[PDB]
Amino acid sequence: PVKAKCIATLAPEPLVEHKHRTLILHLHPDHPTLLTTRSLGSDANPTRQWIERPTTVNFTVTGEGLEYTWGNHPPKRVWAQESGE
Amino acid sequence: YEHTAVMPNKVGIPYKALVERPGYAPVHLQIQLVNTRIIPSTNLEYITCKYKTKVPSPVVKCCGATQCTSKPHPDYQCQVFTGVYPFMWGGAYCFCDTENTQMSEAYVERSEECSIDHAKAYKVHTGTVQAMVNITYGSVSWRSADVYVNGETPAKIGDAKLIIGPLSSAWSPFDNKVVVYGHEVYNYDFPEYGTGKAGSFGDLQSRTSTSNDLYANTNLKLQRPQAGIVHTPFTQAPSGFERWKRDKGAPLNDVAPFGCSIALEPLRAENCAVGSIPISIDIPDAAFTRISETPTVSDLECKITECTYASDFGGIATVAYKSSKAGNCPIHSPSGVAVIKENDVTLAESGSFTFHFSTANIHPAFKLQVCTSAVTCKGDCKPPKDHIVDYPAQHTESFT
Amino acid sequence: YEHTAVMPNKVGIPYKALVERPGYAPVHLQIQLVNTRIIPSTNLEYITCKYKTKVPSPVVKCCGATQCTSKPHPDYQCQVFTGVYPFMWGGAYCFCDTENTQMSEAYVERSEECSIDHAKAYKVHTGTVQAMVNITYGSVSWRSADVYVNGETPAKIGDAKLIIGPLSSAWSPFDNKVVVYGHEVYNYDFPEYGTGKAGSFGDLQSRTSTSNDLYANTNLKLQRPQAGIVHTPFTQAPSGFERWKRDKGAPLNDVAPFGCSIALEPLRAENCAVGSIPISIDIPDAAFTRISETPTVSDLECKITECTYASDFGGIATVAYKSSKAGNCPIHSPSGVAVIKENDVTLAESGSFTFHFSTANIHPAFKLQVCTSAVTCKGDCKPPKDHIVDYPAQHTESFT
């Protein structure tokens, strides 16, 4: 057994949607995709869920940031400061 | 002029402080902590992996017993058995019918995947954090050097000597006990070398890959082969490395706090944005410009024109520059309210040049130090609309 | 029957507890903690050693200057000098008289002794203590196994499974910061890598022996050679490794507390007699003798005959054994007042056999459990005369 880099997986890109300190994400994979995040406060408040059924989800993003992992697609990151004027 | 500065630990954004040396012209900083890779002190305690019941071929004495001995193989399970009639290619071959004896033996051994696909425990201490700090300094305009955090280490790469930390935010996102797998790192209370219950994680526990000795609590129990046929019932828990790959927990690069990323590399935890770092630099005095050569800018005026109450450098402000000479003029807001994109502004003889910035207070009353000339750029700002992209440049939220 | 037992940490003496399993015959212990080697968690911070000013041979330009550059050698001291007339085998050789230039350069380098004769700093954490515990158990009569202290580790060497500690006496005789030299270990607040003042300890500070980089604050100051002759005045502090060998402090194997010895070996601190260890064993039930096979000894009598109020097993006591069968009978005083040399006594049909012991109370009122038969061996003891030899077997001093 060797450390080959398999030609490997990739899940379709997400639909990013803005709200006030909140990411609505209409999402639509090919296969069951383990999504997960890390609210970068010292309060981690992570989430995990395999997604195979297309699902609009939500994420209470904080002031300092959140990150977002659409499958083995690379991890995203997001500034959600205010939007409530 | 050894410019001490408390400094927030946050990776992807410069920290353009200002050198207020009494006597010569000030110089801006641009300190971008491009990385916060950690590399705690650790110890390889034991690799684990899934077993392989690589059965040695059983003995079959045809008429009478064959006592087994406890060979020193890891988890060497061996049990004599009688009452067989072993069908092997010619029907049976041993001519007795109860004195037909069969001695099954099986030991546990590292898989071939153990070398390569293997979890890996650690006792993790704190160690010492690092960074490839870029400073596009002053007029030097470049140094991208790897540094430490311990508050007496310089790194004379470029021309400047810089001392960092120790940081106050000692949260090692790694716990004391950690399991590691390929790239997914698990802050797991692995039981220990030498103990792991069969089926549970660490049923196989080898010190390293080379280590011929190990601990194999697999509950390997041989049973007698059936109805006078040659084979080896090995009844065994599939590994706690088999599970731990599909009934596991989530990875620390997906559950950590305070903003870290991970690698199976020196076991760093990159970019952990938390707390502050007391950083202090000894600039090369040659890089300074004497005060009598930069234009004096006073008798000026500053005002916002479209302040954006935001993260991206949306805040702007014209400045009625009132110079004496003409040239460059480093700039900074000593108040942390306003973070400015421009370190330096060019000046003709008393012109005007807008800069960009970002704030967090509706009424930004921040001083601006245009190369030894302070000014309040008071005003009012507007909220944006479009907030779903990576991390800010503002990082200055307070009471507003 | 998993015989938990609090147990004093003290090296060279057995601890002959007694297994009171309800149902079968009891069995004695003999637990001798032959060693208490410690091996804390540590880090090689920097070797130091005495420098060697291995001068590179100076330049001599005969008419005009030779500007020096700051080469990256450790503590690369170099200073141009003029005004020479260097006598070299033919009188002088450079025909000028003031334009004769001499560029002296000298850097610090590890001695050849640095590889071998070298102090060695450490940041020392606590780690995990060990022991080659002999138990000449029961009728097993032998196991000499290396164990741990962490209170879930077994060591199935022999037949018994034994769990030790964690000890309550966490005094690591090593301090946090330690210097080490050959065999003499010094719990010294070494300044640090990268800092050590010249002359003081750690003027040379190399990470390891191989490490070409180091820190050499030796205050190496070159001076001009005299009166037009070729040589290299290097004015330098002899090392803080030179001192630290004759104005040092004393070694931790000569100044430690609570009774330790030391080695430049895994950095253990052997035989640290302090506190207690909560030890618990799972005996092999096969080693037990069932209760209906050992003689019942009751209707007996015990009395001292010459009790020695002492350390060596000077206390003696006949016992009017009143047996049922004839054979062996393990013995122990469940009270810690009396420590007994004999684990086991042979018995004919109701004879008498003296044993040896040692106590600390003038009136030793200690129970004696002769294989499920208690008895008070009350009496009175006598002080000895002859107290200058190694350590006791009594170790039971209390209020008397």
Swiss-Prot record, chains B, C:
Q: What domain of life does the UniProt record list for this protein's source?
A: Viruses
Q: Tell me what this protein is called.
A: Spike glycoprotein E1
Which segments sit on the Extracellular face? Answer: 1-400
Give membrane topology per the record. Answer: Single-pass type I membrane protein
- What are the start and end residues of every segment in region (E1 fusion peptide loop)? 84-101
Q: Which of this chain's residues carry glycans?
A: 134
Q: Look up and give the organism this protein is from.
A: Eastern equine encephalitis virus (strain Florida 91-469)
Residues of the signal sequence? none
**Which post-translational modifications are recorded for this protein?**
N-glycosylated.
